[PDB]
Symmetry: C3
Subunit: 205 residues, 3 copies
């Protein structure tokens, strides 16, 4: 089966199975393993791998999409001594996650978000982009091949294609999304399309 | 099944199934969905995803190869009002495509071509490279980790490893493939090998 | 089947099947094809592709891990005339390989090692990183999105995130891993975790 429980390990005494909204579409060639919550109208495309086997949840909010070849995984959040590793946990609205993906977020083909990480609502994570040990605000755009490592990206900023942002000083000076910016409407178009695709694929299963 | 029709959606009243030449080899762990044409002696490797579900065809010419983990997909080419989005369509020899891959083209492991895009004959798209909203000429080489976004790459040029080309002024000044260039014969060697691999894999099915 | 022989071709008269230690865990959604040796306690994750069909072995040492979406493949090592192509072969401890991955090595999500290549013991190859025509020493760290092409990386060095190293002069001046370096203990933590994951996943099969 492509939707599976995680295994018993020293930090995981009890396997967890994914909680998937009935309106989500999970492609038969995607893999979803472990403590994962997937929200309404989410599309998970072929060859995506969402794997939550190192403790604590990976959450994917409503009307988000996880495109072909995308990987979601996270660093260990509970050591063998049962103790939570606080550095590897993100907090969003009073709850703890290994990876938090907000609502209306697009994770475009071959991108990767690796916990600890949070991605705010209405954000586009571009093709082949990378997010690790970072919090990405709402209404952001990571252009294709950009990366954010170890930083907080403020709401409404974009990272130009190919740029790798590793310092908070850099992240603080990223340009703003404006109406004339080439990717300012990309995420809303992509979300609308993928919500329709998920419904159409559901009608084939 | 790993070869599948695309779904019914507002822009796609009738599902299309892939048209695949009998001499092509499609790995059982690849995915090919929707309005896709695959030519003679093409090799499609494990974990590749070719997905044509947003309108108009993805074409892969004869003796081309689509290696492990490669993604082909395209932006919407027909809006919900049935109207063609001309910005998202490429024209090659009087025909319209969402993605056009020419003959004898190598899409090497983990690369991605995202429509609208065209790739001319005898071109090598290197490992992890990225092509989006671009036309790449014939006899070109994209070295590993290069990218072409929003540009036209003239015939016979190469992009050095890791370079991300986003402006036409940059693309116009790319170096030429010459006989002493390290990748000048790479594509022809790779094409010959993959044509033989496709035949050998066909004999195992 | 996801574990398969390679095909008969002009350079490969006899198919080879993978040799896999009984304590290794190969995910059902990974692909392993051809002349491949996988050592003890190795974890091979969903969507990884290890493909040895162009001659000579791909070796993955004990307690190594091959994470989601990783690709291992190699250039042709035997031409159609039966003659070994020495440029495309690496030698490690008196034996020849197309790709050699040492013991306790982590190939993190979406990375790729393409032969000819060798990766020494206790080395971390970071997320989305790329190694091709290179020898990477022991105790090295390739940070996410780094790449080494055509070079030898000395023992105990790291490549900063996003850096693409293509010249030996560059590789010779890479910084050293020290105890205060952010990734100095990452590989040992990741190896220990993955050895435990492999055992837990084995208990589900
Ligand atoms: Fe797969
Ligand atoms: Zn991970
Ligand atoms: Zn797409
Ligand atoms: Zn290859």
């Amino acid at each position: 089966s492509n939707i599976r429980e995680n295994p018993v390990t020293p930090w995981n005494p009890e396997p967890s199975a994914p909680v998937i909204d009935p309106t989500a579409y999970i492609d038969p060639q995607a893999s979803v393993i472990g403590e994962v919550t997937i929200g309404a109208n989410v599309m998970v495309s072929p060859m995506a791998s969402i794997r939550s086997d190192e403790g604590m949840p990976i959450f994917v909010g409503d009307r988000s999409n996880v495109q072909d070849g995308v990987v979601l995984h996270a660093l260990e959040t509970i050591n063998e001594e049962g103790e939570p590793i606080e550095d590897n946990i993100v907090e969003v609205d009073g709850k703890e996650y290994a990876v938090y993906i907000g609502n209306n977020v697009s994770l475009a083909h071959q991108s990767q978000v690796h916990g600890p990480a949070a991605v705010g609502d209405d954000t586009f994570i571009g093709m082949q982009a990378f997010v690790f040990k970072s919090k990405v605000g709402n209404n952001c755009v990571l252009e294709p091949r950009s990366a954010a490592i170890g930083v907080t990206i403020p709401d409404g900023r974009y990272i130009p294609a190919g740029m790798v942002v590793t310092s908070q000083a850099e992240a603080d000076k990223l340009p703003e999304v404006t109406d004339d910016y080439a990717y300012s409407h990309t995420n809303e178009a992509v979300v609308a399309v993928n919500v329709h695709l998920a419904e159409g694929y559901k009608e084939t299963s």
